[PDB]
Design a protein around this ligand. Structure first.
Ligand SMILES: [Mg+2]
Ligand SMILES: [Mg+2]
Length: 324
DNA sequence: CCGACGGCGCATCAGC
DNA sequence: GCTGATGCGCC
DNA sequence: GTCGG
């Protein structure tokens, strides 16, 4: 990419503030700056040029002048040398280990992959599975594999009840050639904003995917959200596919468009769009868009994703243009 | 200068 | 047991 | 860390 050196720098700074400093707004600031620079169509010549972009301020502009001048950032060079910071940053790469547990493990002298493996009894269930599939979960999923996965999920959901609709969202719906995981939006006519006319709607689908050995592990599960592990079947004699993260979100059928807007993302696109909604006097979640009175009002009618954009005076952006 | 920064599901825990 | 925080995760 | 007012 045109400015990949800079955007990598800012992402590494972002991860430092989140994982080590526990400063979530600096993390968001860095990631917003990284995103706006990533889609800037010119090779950046100076911090001043970057500062013209929204989300890039004086401090990042200075860092960008240092990086352009030398190819590196002393502040990051120092961080890479700090053992506590390096340890904490590594541990947070395990699913279920966040900034707080990472610092706690380091305190207890648990700071390497070998440390984790011989202390599995100190991990909660999520963390145990995150450690189990540590290597697999850092691999990306080719779109060709995502298509196979889509076919299995949609056909197995159909077998449970022909009235389910499963939509693959996330980066896959944005047209990405590789994804970090699979995100599945699920609806059923029995589950609306007005009534839940049938229990276990999510459970039945999860069970069926487990029965056919597609879902292999559960990280968490409730009435509307499943987070777990899945795996494509492999053919005779060939190596197994890596295990993959799968999220399933059951959304009220009448709120499909808000739900598919949310689950298509990107995460940064959602933060940008919801912030713009607020500036326009609305609030958007995965169910509704409501006016601000500063208390939310009643949900506004929505019959398309585009209706949501219209409310906040944004021209419509197809999924493939939401990769911020 | 300084308040706000998107919004929410599930797991875990503390206090009652 | 319930309620409310907090941690971690999803986009 | 950046922005808006
Ligand atoms: Mg995804
Ligand atoms: Mg996901």
């Amino acid at each position: 990419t045109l400015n990949g050196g800079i955007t990598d720098m800012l992402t590494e700074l972002a991860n430092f503030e989140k994982n080590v400093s526990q400063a979530i707004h600096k993390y968001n600031a860095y990631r917003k700056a990284a995103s706006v620079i990533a889609k800037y169509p010119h090779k950046i010549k100076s911090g001043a040029e970057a500062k013209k972009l929204p989300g890039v301020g004086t401090k990042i502009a200075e860092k960008i002048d240092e990086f352009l001048a030398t190819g590196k950032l002393r502040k990051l060079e120092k961080i890479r040398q700090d053992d506590t910071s390096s340890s904490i940053n590594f541990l947070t790469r395990v699913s279920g280990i966040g900034p707080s547990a990472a610092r706690k493990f380091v305190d207890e002298g648990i700071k390497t992959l070998e440390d984790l493996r011989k202390n599995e009894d100190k991990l909660n269930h999520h963390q145990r599975i995150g450690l189990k599939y540590f290597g697999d979960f850092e691999k990306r999923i080719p779109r060709e594999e995502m298509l196979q996965m889509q076919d299995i999920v949609l056909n197995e959901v159909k077998k449970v009840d022909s009235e389910y609709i499963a939509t693959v969202c996330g980066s896959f719906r944005r047209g990405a050639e590789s994804s970090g995981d699979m995100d599945v939006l699920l609806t059923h006519p029995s589950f609306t904003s007005e009534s839940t006319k049938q229990p276990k709607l999510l459970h039945q689908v999860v069970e069926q995917l487990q029965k056919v050995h597609f879902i292999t592990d559960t990280l968490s599960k409730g009435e509307t959200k499943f987070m777990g592990v899945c795996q494509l079947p492999s053919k005779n004699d060939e190596k197994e596919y890596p295990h993959r993260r799968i999220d399933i979100r059951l959304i009220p059928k009448d709120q499909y468009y808000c739900g598919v807007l949310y689950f298509t993302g990107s995460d940064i696109f959602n933060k940008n769009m919801r912030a713009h909604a607020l500036e326009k006097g609305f609030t958007i979640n995965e169910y509704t868009i409501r006016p601000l009175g500063g208390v939310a009002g009643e949900p506004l009618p929505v019959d398309s994703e585009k209706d949501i954009f219209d409310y906040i005076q944004w021209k419509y952006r197809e999924p493939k243009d939401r990769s911020e």
